[PDB]
Amino acid sequence: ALFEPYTLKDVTLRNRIAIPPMSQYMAEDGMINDWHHVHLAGLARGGAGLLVVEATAVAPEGRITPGCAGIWSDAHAQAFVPVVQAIKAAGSVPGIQIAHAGRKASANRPWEGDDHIAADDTRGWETIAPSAIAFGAHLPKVPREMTLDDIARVKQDFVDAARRARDAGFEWIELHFAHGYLGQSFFSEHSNKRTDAYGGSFDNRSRFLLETLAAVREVWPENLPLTARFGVLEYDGRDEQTLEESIELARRFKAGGLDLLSVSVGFTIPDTNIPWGPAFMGPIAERVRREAKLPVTSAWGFGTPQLAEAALQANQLDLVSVGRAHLADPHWAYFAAKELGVEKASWTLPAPYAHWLE
Amino acid sequence: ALFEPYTLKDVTLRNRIAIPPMSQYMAEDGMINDWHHVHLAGLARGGAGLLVVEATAVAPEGRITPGCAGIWSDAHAQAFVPVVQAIKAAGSVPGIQIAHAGRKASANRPWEGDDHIAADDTRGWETIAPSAIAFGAHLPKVPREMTLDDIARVKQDFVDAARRARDAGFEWIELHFAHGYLGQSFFSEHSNKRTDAYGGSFDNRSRFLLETLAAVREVWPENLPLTARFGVLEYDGRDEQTLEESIELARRFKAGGLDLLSVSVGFTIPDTNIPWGPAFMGPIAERVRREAKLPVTSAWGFGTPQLAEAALQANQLDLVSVGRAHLADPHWAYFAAKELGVEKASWTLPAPYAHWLE
Numbered sequence: 138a139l140f141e142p143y144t145l146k147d148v149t150l151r152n153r154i155a156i157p158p159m160s161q162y163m164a165e166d167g168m169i170n171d172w173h174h175v176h177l178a179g180l181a182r183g184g185a186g187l188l189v190v191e192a193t194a195v196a197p198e199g200r201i202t203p204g205c206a207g208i209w210s211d212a213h214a215q216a217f218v219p220v221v222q223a224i225k226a227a228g229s230v231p232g233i234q235i236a237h238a239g240r241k242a243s244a245n246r247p248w249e250g251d252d253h254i255a256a257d258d259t260r261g262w263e264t265i266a267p268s269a270i271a272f273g274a275h276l277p278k279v280p281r282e283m284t285l286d287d288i289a290r291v292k293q294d295f296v297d298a299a300r301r302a303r304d305a306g307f308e309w310i311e312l313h314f315a316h317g318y319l320g321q322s323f324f325s326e327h328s329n330k331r332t333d334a335y336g337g338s339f340d341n342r343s344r345f346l347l348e349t350l351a352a353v354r355e356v357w358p359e360n361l362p363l364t365a366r367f368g369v370l371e372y373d374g375r376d377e378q379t380l381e382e383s384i385e386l387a388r389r390f391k392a393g394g395l396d397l398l399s400v401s402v403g404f405t406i407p408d409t410n411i412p413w414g415p416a417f418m419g420p421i422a423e424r425v426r427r428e429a430k431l432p433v434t435s436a437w438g439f440g441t442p443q444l445a446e447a448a449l450q451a452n453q454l455d456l457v458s459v460g461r462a463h464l465a466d467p468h469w470a471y472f473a474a475k476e477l478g479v480e481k482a483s484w485t486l487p488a489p490y491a492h493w494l495e
Numbered sequence: 496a497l498f499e500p501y502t503l504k505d506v507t508l509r510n511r512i513a514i515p516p517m518s519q520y521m522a523e524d525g526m527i528n529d530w531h532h533v534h535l536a537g538l539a540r541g542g543a544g545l546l547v548v549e550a551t552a553v554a555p556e557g558r559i560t561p562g563c564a565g566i567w568s569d570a571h572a573q574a575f576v577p578v579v580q581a582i583k584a585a586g587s588v589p590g591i592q593i594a595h596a597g598r599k600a601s602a603n604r605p606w607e608g609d610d611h612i613a614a615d616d617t618r619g620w621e622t623i624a625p626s627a628i629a630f631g632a633h634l635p636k637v638p639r640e641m642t643l644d645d646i647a648r649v650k651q652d653f654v655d656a657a658r659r660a661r662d663a664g665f666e667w668i669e670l671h672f673a674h675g676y677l678g679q680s681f682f683s684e685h686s687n688k689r690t691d692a693y694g695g696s697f698d699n700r701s702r703f704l705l706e707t708l709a710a711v712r713e714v715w716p717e718n719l720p721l722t723a724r725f726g727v728l729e730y731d732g733r734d735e736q737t738l739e740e741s742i743e744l745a746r747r748f749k750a751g752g753l754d755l756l757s758v759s760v761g762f763t764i765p766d767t768n769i770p771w772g773p774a775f776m777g778p779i780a781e782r783v784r785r786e787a788k789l790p791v792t793s794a795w796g797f798g799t800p801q802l803a804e805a806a807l808q809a810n811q812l813d814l815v816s817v818g819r820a821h822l823a824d825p826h827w828a829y830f831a832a833k834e835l836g837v838e839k840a841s842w843t844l845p846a847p848y849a850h851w852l853e
């Protein structure tokens with residue numbers, strides 16, 4: 138099942154293996170470079186059906202860190218063009234995740250402290266969010282409460298980013314509404330304490346996300362998959378109520394033209410108890426898929442090829458996202474094809490490799 | 496031992512893992528392209544101490560196939576510059592193998608027949624060699640016997656190639672005197688039937704190789720390793736006599752400034768019986784190392800990390816060359832570091848990978 142193709146709108150993936158967005162923290166002032174080119178091109182040649190580029194900020198302040206990729210100008214977008222073209226030459230579908238880190242912005246690279254940047258560090262910047270409340274823990278900075286104009290500006294930033302992504306040749310877009318960043322923080326009552334149209338009720342908390350989706354849909358081609366990543370629960374002791382609301386929003390996403398949902402955990406606050414384990418998201422993704430009638434992918438521990446295969450056969454997932462295993466071995470799809478007994482497994486790879494590995 | 500550094504002349508490799516030349520057959524009219532850039536850069540980031548670029552023809556007719564890389568003009572050399580710079584940025588030493596395919600030239604890509612190109616195929620060309628005798632089998636073309644001017648011209652081609660390699664920034668050069676191509680074919684009595692100064696006696700058969708080495712040494716910096724690959728036996732029933740002469744030539748190579756010998760099998764003729772097996776070259780490489788007092792590397796089946804480690808501990812090898820395992824997994828050095836219990840094995844890789852794999 139892992140090596141059956143998948144067709145969504147006009148796009149066909151050669152298999153069900155997706156490489157999820159994985160931030161590299163190697164960009165400079167948002168501009169990607171040869172780190173990203175070789176990294177992504179090498180992954181595409183590894184055999185995966187879909188490669189989703191790391192979180193790419195729609196605005197400078199929406200980067201997580203000083204090394205995050207950005208697409209907030211045409212020059213930033215044009216930098217993606219040769220990379221997109223290399224992914225395509227390798228036969229993988231190029232996708233990109235567009236993002237805004239919200240209150241989690243202005244942080245250090247994970248191997249450089251992983252924490253909010255010190256006040257007098259010239260690299261740092263003010264963060265913005267639905268409400269002036271800090272994440273806490275290693276991210277204690279209190280964000281600035283967004284004005285209605287801020288909200289309009291960020292929505293337009295998402296539109297501009299999607300427009301650029303389209304024109305750079307991406308065939309698959311993913312709105313980053315997960316992992317506690319801006320979009321996730323608008324939906325969660327933990328972080329959203331607004332009393333205007335963007336806070337309070339379920340309708341109001343959903344509003345930012347739904348409007349951003351609608352605005353993006355105006356510029357993103359109908360025949361190319363339009364997707365999002367969304368944390369559907371927090372493991373914060375409110376899981377049944379949170380999952381119910383998240384599934385309801387997924388229904389609204391679908392009605393608003395969303396083709397597939399990448400199902401994640403919220404990470405909106407630090408005080409949680411996540412039951413980490415191989416493929417632990419499987420049952421959650423399946424419930425979203427069933428109850429919203431929407432294709433899904435998810436991640437965490439699917440680098441064991443048999444787990445990926447089991448998830449697909451059980452219809453918990455439509456695509457299986459495999460992250461860290463691809464940092465370890467960019468040719469993981471070849472490893473998986475062998476593990477699963479695929480005919481001519483070496484031809485998961487391009488000829489100059491496949492010929493010799495048969 | 497596999498992860499101890501190695502210093503040769505002014506060059507220091509971060510470990511004893513070498514990626515040997517592996518032809519990609521993806522070049523056009525000798526010019527390399529983004530296939531080679533991403534392929535080589537990705538390998539460099541995988542952790543290997545030394546990356547030797549595939550056989551690169553010193554002249555158009557010295558390509559094995561229409562897809563082989565070339566360095567027979569300054570424009571061909573300049574194309575290597577960004578690749579060399581990427582290898583260095585990744586902390587690997589960039590080397591290159593310069594070559595002339597001799598009677599084995601003008602062949603199809605291995606996945607396109609692997610045989611001599613048909614007479615009326617517009618891609619083909621006349622081959623040149625010490626004597627007009629065919630390899631046989633899948634390479635039945637009779638080469639043209641080289642004139643003394645041909646020999647002068649090819650030596651100068653090797654000099655020009657080494658000069659270009661130097662200027663492109665390579666830190667390690669390997670003369671391809673192995674695998675039945677031009678250099679190997681001059682040394683072997685099977686293929687060299689000349690009656691002039693370049694044939695007959697051991698001195699005469701060695702001459703082409705020794706003069707080419709001397710000529711190259713004039714332009715290749717003294718402080719950068721000067722090496723060659725050389726088939727030391729054929730498994731043709733003449734192994735003791737052939738090994739004795741090959742070791743004698745290795746002594747002459749050393750006296751003439753050779754820093755390290757990549758020990759191989761000759762492949763000069765098809766009628767042989769090679770005892771293929773994991774690390775089977777080990778005992779042969781050790782005998783050359785001992786009897787010529789010269790550092791060596793070799794290859795074939797060392798992708799099993801424990802075999803690589805054993806070879807080094809037994810002083811059979813100074814560097815271990817690992818080829819096909821790197822086509823399967825460009826991050827093989829990381830796999831090896833884990834297998835061998837290296838401290839902080841993930842940091843065999845660059846930070847954007849290592850941080851997450853610890």
Ligand SMILES: Cc1cc2nc3c(=O)[nH]c(=O)nc-3n(C[C@H](O)[C@H](O)[C@H](O)COP(=O)(O)O)c2cc1C
Nearest residue numbers: 157158159160191192436437438439459460461851
């Ligand atoms: C280095 C790294 C970078 C990541 N970057 C992103 C990102 O930019 N956006 C995102 O939504 N998830 C990101 N993730 C989360 C992954 O997409 C994925 O969900 C996670 O690694 C779990 O899958 P795995 O066990 O196969 O690695 C990242 C994960 C890692 C390890």
Ligand SMILES: Cc1cc2nc3c(=O)[nH]c(=O)nc-3n(C[C@H](O)[C@H](O)[C@H](O)COP(=O)(O)O)c2cc1C
Nearest residue numbers: 493515516517518549550794795796797817818819
């Ligand atoms: C695809 C491929 C290309 C190769 N190209 C070259 C080459 O250009 N020059 C050379 O001397 N050897 C070449 N070789 C031989 C390798 O360098 C090496 O000796 C051989 O693969 C055995 O090592 P291994 O078992 O680790 O693969 C090539 C081997 C392969 C599989």
Ligand SMILES: O=c1ccc2ccccc2o1
Nearest residue numbers: 159160192201247315316
């Ligand atoms: O959305 C994200 C962005 C970055 C990241 C890094 C490590 C782990 C998870 C992550 O999720």
Ligand SMILES: O=c1ccc2ccccc2o1
Nearest residue numbers: 182226227228487529530
């Ligand atoms: O799988 C492939 C096959 C061919 C190719 C050519 C150039 C660049 C990347 C490529 O990837």
Ligand SMILES: O=c1ccc2ccccc2o1
Nearest residue numbers: 440461462465851852853
């Ligand atoms: O194949 C791999 C290798 C390492 C690793 C580390 C963390 C998570 C997943 C991983 O997968």
Ligand SMILES: O=c1ccc2ccccc2o1
Nearest residue numbers: 517518550559605673674
């Ligand atoms: O010198 C060489 C050049 C190419 C090659 C291809 C496959 C196997 C061995 C080889 O050796």
Ligand SMILES: O=c1ccc2ccccc2o1
Nearest residue numbers: 171172540584585586845
């Ligand atoms: O190992 C590395 C570390 C950094 C780096 C930067 C640019 C290109 C390649 C690189 O490789």
Ligand SMILES: O=c1ccc2ccccc2o1
Nearest residue numbers: 493494495798819820823
């Ligand atoms: O790791 C590997 C995987 C495949 C393979 C095939 C032939 C020779 C060596 C190999 O090494």
